[PDB]
Structure 1
Amino acid sequence: GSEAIAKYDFKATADDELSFKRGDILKVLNEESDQNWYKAELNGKDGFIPKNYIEMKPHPG
């Protein structure tokens, strides 16, 4: 899994989507995907998140 920070509030509008707030750290499950939706987990929930809403955690420095 890879961490990513939410850059905007996102509200799920389908049952398979995962809501989150700006600042939340999501765990992205299939970062290697070339799709514009990722699968992620946050605070015990999971679902699809939009790729362009998040910033992947880089290596420090």
Structure 2
Amino acid sequence: MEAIAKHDFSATADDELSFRKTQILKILNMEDDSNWYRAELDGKEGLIPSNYIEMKNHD
């Protein structure tokens, strides 16, 4: 499973994952939290805004 996120931001709280625009992020679980999503990166897990990403699986 893959999801993209284009926004270069620097998180506010420590449990807020920062990132770069157009980054390719790994997604862990989607469903009980449409607005808040749990993504993964290099092995580290974290909280972020699902609104800065979109599914790259149109097909």
TM-score of the alignment, normalized to the shorter chain, above 0.5? yes
Give the aligned partner of residue 45 of structure 1: 44
**Offset at residue 55 of structure 1 (A):** 1.2
Tell me how many residue pairs correspond in the alignment: 59
Task: Return the letter of the residue paired with 1:40.
Answer: A
Change (3 A) 1:31 1:10: farther
Cα RMSD for the two superposed structures: 1.7
1:15-39: per-residue Cα shift (whole Å, max 9, x none)?
A: 1121111121111111223331101
TM-score of the two chains, using structure 2 as the length reference: 0.76
TM-score of the two chains, using structure 1 as the length reference: 0.75
Residue segments in structure 1 that go unaligned for 5+ positions in a row:
none
**Aligned sequence identity (%):** 69
Task: Return the letter of the residue paired with 1:8.
Answer: H
Residue segments in structure 2 that go unaligned for 5+ positions in a row:
none
